[PDB]
Write a protein that binds this ligand. Sequence first.
Ligand SMILES: NS(=O)(=O)c1cc2c(cc1Cl)N[C@H]([C@H]1C[C@H]3C=C[C@@H]1C3)NS2(=O)=O
Ligand SMILES: NS(=O)(=O)c1cc2c(cc1Cl)N[C@H]([C@H]1C[C@H]3C=C[C@@H]1C3)NS2(=O)=O
Ligand SMILES: N[C@@H](CCC(=O)O)C(=O)O
Lengths: 44, 420, 330, 147, 50, 49
Amino acid sequence: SDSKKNSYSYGWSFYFGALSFIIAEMVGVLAVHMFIDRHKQLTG
Amino acid sequence: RDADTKIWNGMVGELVYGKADIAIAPLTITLVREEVIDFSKPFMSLGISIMIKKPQKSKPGVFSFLDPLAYEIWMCIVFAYIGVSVVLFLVSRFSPYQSSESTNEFGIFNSLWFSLGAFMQQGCDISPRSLSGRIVGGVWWFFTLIIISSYTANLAAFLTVERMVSPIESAEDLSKQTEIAYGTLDSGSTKEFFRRSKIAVFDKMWTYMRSAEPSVFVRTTAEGVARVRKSKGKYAYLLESTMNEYIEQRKPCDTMKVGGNLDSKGYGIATPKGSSLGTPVNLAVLKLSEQGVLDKLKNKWWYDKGECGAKDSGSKEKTSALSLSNVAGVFYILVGGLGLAMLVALIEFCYKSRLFDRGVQMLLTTVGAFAAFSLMTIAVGTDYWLYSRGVCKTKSVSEDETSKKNEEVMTHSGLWRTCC
Amino acid sequence: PYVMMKKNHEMLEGNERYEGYCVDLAAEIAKHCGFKYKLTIVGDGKYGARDADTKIWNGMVGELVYGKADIAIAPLTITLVREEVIDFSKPFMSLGISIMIKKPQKSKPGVFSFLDPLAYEIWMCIVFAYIGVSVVLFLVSRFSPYSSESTNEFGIFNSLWFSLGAFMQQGCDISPRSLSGRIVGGVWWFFTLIIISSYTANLAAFLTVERMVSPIESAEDLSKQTEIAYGTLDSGSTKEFFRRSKIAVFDKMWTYMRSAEPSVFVRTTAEGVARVRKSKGKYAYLLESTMNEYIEQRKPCDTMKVGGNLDSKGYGIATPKGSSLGTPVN
Amino acid sequence: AFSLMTIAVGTDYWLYSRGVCKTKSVSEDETSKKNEEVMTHSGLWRTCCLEGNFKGLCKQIDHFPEDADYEADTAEYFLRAVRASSIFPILSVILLFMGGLCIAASEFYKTRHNIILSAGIFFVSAGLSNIIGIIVYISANAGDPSK
Amino acid sequence: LAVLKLSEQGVLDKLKNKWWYDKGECGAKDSGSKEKTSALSLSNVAGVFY
Amino acid sequence: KYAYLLESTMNEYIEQRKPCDTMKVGGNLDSKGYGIATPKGSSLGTPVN
Ligand SMILES: NS(=O)(=O)c1cc2c(cc1Cl)N[C@H]([C@H]1C[C@H]3C=C[C@@H]1C3)NS2(=O)=O
Ligand SMILES: NS(=O)(=O)c1cc2c(cc1Cl)N[C@H]([C@H]1C[C@H]3C=C[C@@H]1C3)NS2(=O)=O
Ligand SMILES: N[C@@H](CCC(=O)O)C(=O)O
């Protein structure tokens, strides 16, 4: 039918891969803030 | 037949006992009637069919603005929004090989605002102003030109569509639920059909109907239509299809015939045994059917004398102004956004009027690196991605045909393995 | 316009009281064939049919068969059953059975037709949302900002201008910089993305509509809808056409007319045109096309000819069977 | 602003529609026929007939209408439940009043200096409650058919 | 009498449901666009993400 | 750059033949007919009518 018969739904493994994205982006922000902060201590 | 006195009643009795010569009437061609009077070739076909109350038109939702794009794309837009803002931060903030660091105004908080602004088609105050920064800004502009022009292509149509939603599409769909109620006639051939049912679906239907409180059976067809119309869409009545099409074409036009015919039977002109009329009556039915008269007499009485007029009335199409009820969800989010904005401004005012650390964020990164690595390996390894109908261990390999894998089953697939 | 009463009917006498197309045609025929004539009107005002179960002609055909009249200079349709009792001349106009409906009175696009894709209650809530956002964006920004207030460029009057720039999609110089400022700016950006795009998507729908130009496009459209009654002139050739036809669409149209009450048949053409004009477009009158052209081209101009002619017929001069002047009229 | 809202929530000349009059408020006898859809000044609670022989009679609105032909989904249910209790115009009136107490406690109890700020928040929040009351009102008037 | 008895017992139905439907070689899915306003799907605009 | 005047029944026939590069414009300027012709006094003349 019109996207009705199969009625595909996403389980918890899919949403963990999504939460594995958002955590990996927040860490990648925080790792850059360190690389900025390591050159604030390097130069002064 | 009366069971003991062994005399026929009804119109079949009128033909056997010589009172009448021909039964031009909706008389069902059965076995036990065939043995005592001849039947014609059937002049009209019918079967057991499902009558449900006609569902009201589905109004669009509160959140009908996000209906042009599926919920796949909205989640992937949010992922692409966060993805661009982090890359636009990472690109515009390196140590440039003491004001060289502080040149670009793209922190992580501004870069979220540049990416939001480009997507919402409002120009933002800051510009990337660096070669690798402008490629991120340039590509996200081409993203949002395509998506928004795809989104707003037919946004007025998705806000003003109503669809009839059938709760039941067929007899198997009525089999797998108990909220909507079955019903048949208390004394009829239709209830006889569910006694002698070796089909597993129809036998499942009969064990329900026998053990049901209050009684799903009705004494007359007139009460069975009224129980459909009273019980507000929670009752489905099983009756012959020719009556079912007739009740649909009568006012208040609040019935609907769903599903194909479960059995197939016929109405035939009945003559007594040995009547000379029996041969021309057979041949006259065959002359009318080839000429289309029987197609013409059915299309007249059932549909053209119809009080409903469903064909021409549903055929006309109009496009109309947006109502406030159609886009009321956008206003609910806006005033919800305003109340959130006052609440943030208060809690930051109380905090400023009334301890970040480099060591704490270092432990925050180590856990978050492990938390990302844990969630990703569990996602790739374990197989609970998609819940859909699929091939299971009934006939998981295509070993023999005709078996159809229990006609299908719910199956939690994964990135490599499917499991049911 | 076949036979009319002349405006000076009181002043004139004899043939001079009548004027029309048939009046001019009868003069031209008698000029060629040299016979003096007197113009009369049929008594019952019917064109002519056979009575059912009585087998007696009425009307103008009935006067010619029964010998009361010599010749018929009339809109008299050459049909089968009329030919068997009276001779016709060669046709002098060609026509057909056509449909007449009431013209749907067109709704003119007003001077403010651009406000039509959105209702009059939704524009009122846009302005209330425009006022409401511009004050909350003021209260957020000028909120003891910790000299303090001088930092942000959002007063009230700049906030009314920032919000006006976001709605009409034109952008502005100033932009919110505080976190609670970027929320109210961000939500109003999402508001104006939907509402402006719902406007432009619906405005494409209102400009590219053709219009309700005809509910009835042809004769099969009358056959399928029973909301609209249709009838013919009683005791005329058009009623005899739907009775005698074996076409599938025309048989359905005779099934409707014969059964439905109140009687869709009319007595005269002038009565039937009125039933079109007094039924709000729910009565479509099946009449001859040459009468349909004449009604359509005259005031009050609220009748419309839909569809093609249902067939092709003709008007003919009629004399009795074996009359003395049948050949000179040909 | 406190007066105009208490007047607006109090009176019942909100909407002029072809409403079900007091004679058809119950289905009392056959062929009452609602005086062929008589003009009615419905309101926030009271729908009352005007310019008729049976004008001057009022009844509470069936915000939940009747045993009608509906499956009663949750979106329409929550919208009817809000408009029935009219929580958004009532929250507007209370929020207008609390700003009225703050503007009264401005001259008296002065130098507290944040009352005049808080009164600004009560006046802004009362307006945002007011338009959210107007929108649910107009979106609850879809039961009027409008074919 | 044989045809009528087989019809009432569902034998003619059971033999039809067997032979016509047991093959099932392709699910043809010939409905297609029964409803007109289809929500735009990710496969249609996946190139922009790429 | 050329418009030809001819009877309408031929004109509709040339339009429905390839190369399909003709068109019939305007209404009929006069009106005439094709009729089955019988000799004078033939008994066929009445049933042919
Ligand atoms: N349209 S209908 O269902 O009323 C209908 C039903 C039937 C028709 C013709 C029509 Cl139009 N003819 C057939 C006839 C053809 C041969 C087979 C059965 C009889 C003899 N009977 S039927 O299958 O009962
Ligand atoms: N569903 S089907 O086509 O297999 C089918 C079709 C038909 C069946 C039985 C089945 Cl199972 N029986 C009827 C028969 C029963 C009586 C009514 C009509 C004839 C005599 N003929 S039918 O209407 O042609
Ligand atoms: N030409 C028609 C007019 C009447 C009708 O349309 O029925 C006739 O003479 O019969």
